[PDB]
Design a protein around this nucleic acid. Sequence first.
DNA 1: CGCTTAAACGCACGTACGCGCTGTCCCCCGCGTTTTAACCGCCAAGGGGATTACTCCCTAGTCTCCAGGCACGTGTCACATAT
DNA 2: TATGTGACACGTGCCTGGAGACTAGGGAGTAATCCCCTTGGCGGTTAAAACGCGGGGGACAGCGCGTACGTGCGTTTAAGCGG
Lengths: 109, 109, 109, 97, 97, 95, 95, 95, 83, 83
Amino acid sequence: ARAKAKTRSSRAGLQFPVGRVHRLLRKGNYSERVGAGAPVYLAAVLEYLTAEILELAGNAARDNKKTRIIPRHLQLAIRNDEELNKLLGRVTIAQGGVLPNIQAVLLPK
Amino acid sequence: ARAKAKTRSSRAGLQFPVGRVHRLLRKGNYSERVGAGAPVYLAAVLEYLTAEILELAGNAARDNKKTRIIPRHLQLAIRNDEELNKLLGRVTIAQGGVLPNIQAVLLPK
Amino acid sequence: ARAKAKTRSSRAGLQFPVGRVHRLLRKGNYSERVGAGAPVYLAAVLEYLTAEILELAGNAARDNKKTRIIPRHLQLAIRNDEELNKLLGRVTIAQGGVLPNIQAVLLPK
Amino acid sequence: KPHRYRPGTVALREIRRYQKSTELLIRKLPFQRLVREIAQDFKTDLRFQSSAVMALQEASEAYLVGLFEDTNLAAIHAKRVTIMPKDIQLARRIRGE
Amino acid sequence: KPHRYRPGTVALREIRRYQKSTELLIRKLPFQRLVREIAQDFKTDLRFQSSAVMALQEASEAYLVGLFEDTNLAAIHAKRVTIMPKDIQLARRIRGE
Amino acid sequence: KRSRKESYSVYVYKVLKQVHPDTGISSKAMGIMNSFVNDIFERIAGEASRLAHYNKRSTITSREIQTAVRLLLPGELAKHAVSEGTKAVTKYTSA
Amino acid sequence: KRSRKESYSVYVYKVLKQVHPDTGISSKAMGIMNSFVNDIFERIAGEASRLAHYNKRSTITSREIQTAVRLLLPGELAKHAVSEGTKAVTKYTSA
Amino acid sequence: KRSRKESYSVYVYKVLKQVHPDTGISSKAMGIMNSFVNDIFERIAGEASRLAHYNKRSTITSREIQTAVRLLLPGELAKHAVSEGTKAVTKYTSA
Amino acid sequence: KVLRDNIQGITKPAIRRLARRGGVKRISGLIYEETRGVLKVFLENVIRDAVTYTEHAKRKTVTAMDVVYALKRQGRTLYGFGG
Amino acid sequence: KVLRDNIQGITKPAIRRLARRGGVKRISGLIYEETRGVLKVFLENVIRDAVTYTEHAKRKTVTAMDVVYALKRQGRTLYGFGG
DNA sequence: CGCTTAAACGCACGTACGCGCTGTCCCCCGCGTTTTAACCGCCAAGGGGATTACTCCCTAGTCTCCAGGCACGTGTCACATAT
DNA sequence: TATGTGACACGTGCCTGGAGACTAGGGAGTAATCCCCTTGGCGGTTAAAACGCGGGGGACAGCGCGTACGTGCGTTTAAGCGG
């Protein structure tokens, strides 16, 4: 009588929710209509970015031998990528700290 | 049996088009509903701002004995006001020139 | 009666033909049964590796200012990726040529 | 004689420590008291989420520390290792504060 | 004797003149040449409104001039009057670029 | 002729004659002022939209317009903009 | 009786498990990631809104989103996002 | 009258325009890709068969081919191939 | 209740800690009060913004969501408080 | 058809004029090429986005209104060309 | 409010560092001359921006129904802490 | 390397938000056009750029110096934690 429920995220093959992003865009008042592929594309883009920053955080954690992601590792991952640094040059992170960085003249001899 | 079509700018004693601004807000997609006094308040604020900047421009044009306002006069007005410059530091005017500014160390003995 | 035939390549959403690969593994005598997801995995990894070597070839062709890839581009691409090169050290390419490589003592002075 | 490090050695060690470390460089209670002091001037009897005070905190020393490498770049530009408040003034004004 | 002004005097007079002036200091058609040259590096054989060319010229000259005031502030902050490109790099690093 | 293109020239001229009947205007300065008023308009509209979603408000009203102009305008500009807007809101309230 | 609140927790935790099955998470790092994902969401959405205004379109399509990616995201992240997202467009197009 | 012969040309063409719309291809380079996909195909296929013999498993599943591609392909290419295949088999599992 | 000079509640060694996290080697004695004034200006900007949000919000107490709105108003976005 | 060198079209006296407008009293000989590079970076950053607008506008002619959009995207809003 | 130390203050002595001065060398603007191409300005051409029409693709919206993700509870081991 | 622990992480109820079916219509895709805007090119001219000489002003190294933070140790108290 009715088709079985199948998510549009799986229709994209994506993990971020297509219906939730579509609802946020509709209620976020950006245009009175929206293309169907637009929130799918959007959720795909954010899933790609979330994925890649998640491997970068994983490598930062593994280099510092901690199994769990810490905002220090997020800071160290985000500042050591010049691409991501230019993405977020004005973005601050709570309890993030800075890069360990010294000037050469500040070092002795 | 319609009454005389009177204008809301005159109702608020204003110059800026209340109806055009309300139309822009309804079609600029900031909310689906707009309170009636909001475009009036906005147009009045804009009228005050335009009035003061044009007054400063007329003062600057009078200082340079010029009877028609100039973008150079606009630059000299907008940059010599502290509140306006902190309001519009990152905004540039075409053909404005620069403020007359020479450092004292650049100045000779 | 019957739904529209939608391909398993579409079900994965990948370009390599799932049915052809499954048919080849059935007629290539590797096991008496094969799991359904295994040729999907095969097509995925093949399309990943073809995608990366095609990135390398397109980059080399744009370095050589050519629109269409040539076996010289293929040689230069496959020899300068260490995982690909040591993947294919004993694999020879038709008309690939060689890497530009000169020993230091061959140079004068 | 008792042990005594030469100038800059303890500074280097604490620079490396606080670069590695992430915990707060401000005593929390006088910071919160100062936030209440400033906020009372603009609106009376203002109450605070502690998380709001904390977010104000990391915003504050993030701004300060960024201004501090700006100051350090100004100082190494001026061939110096001792900073002066004119360096901070230069950094603010070139940023446009 | 053919008169020769002492150095920097004509430079300061130029500073006064070009602070007084409002016009563009870049040759228009070489600027358009460079704009089209960089345009084909993104997309070849486009067309241009001349208004876009003057808009880019205004924005470019304004950005350059503000960069030079920042450079001048850095140089006098380093107790110098002669600027070097290290000062420009410093100012760009302060601006977050 | 062609289609009508929106401009703010007449209102700029009227406000100009309110503040300076004696002086003239260049049309390029008119365009600069059009850019000015459009820029400030879209700024205020943007933060009004933000504040409407912050309080989850389906209607944008004048109180957060007041909030936004107090937010952007520094000091003296903000209080006298509030004064002018409140005066005009009261006059339209009295029709 | 308490109201439900929206989070990205299950999605980020899953995609963490594909990118790194053995790697854990701290909760305030998830708060930071929530702030990042939301922040980029309204960055792209605001770009899409203004680009829809500039071409006078009342419908935002995947072309607009892709243009916003090319604008805000620089360099390689833009083109990899374009590749995977256009791939995703075909994936939903098949459905 | 001729006989139909298999090639991997058209799928390489879809992949090529997916990854580089601006880039053409010569037909003998296409043949080199054909040799590539064939050679790796029976490499992996024989690996899967002999692994299936080692554990006396008469059915080759995705675990087996994942093991095999981890054996032959080194590291970076291996792990990203693992990622591609893993998300592919999960979306097929949903398919 | 009534508070007087808590700008000096931010101690000089705290300022030295802040400089060392920024990797500053040598700090003048003139630094601390000037930086106190600078941070005072910065804090009064952001708390003016956050307050203005709060009386618009019809809340008497400041919330952190107003705070993060204030920081993104100033181009100083901070992550990790439910924003 | 193609162009090879127009960055040198921003000549040294033009840089001198801009520096005197910028209030620079003395200009090194090393300045001009570095300013050419920095100017090149700024112009390519704005014109990439202006292009992206222009094909997103489905045009092959570059318009100034897209230049305004791109400049105000990067926090460099210019008055005198809007509309 | 009631303990409970950590660090903030504070003094004290020492070094190193801004800075003051000068020697010295070299760099770059002042000036004049040469070249040169920018620019007016004029005109031809054509190209696509923009406009109007026309028909249609999708999508926003409505009603139904259901499963997903978050609240809720819990357990448990990676990490904080100590040495 | 030894030890607790609570924070992370995972099973569970649910309702609610998101998907399925269907439609109106309307914004959007597309065809045509034209004309105006944009490109292409040709002659005069001079300012604009470029180049050379020069000569002073400035950058900067050297050296010292006195002081003002750095470092070290003793104290207070005031920050910090529990309730």
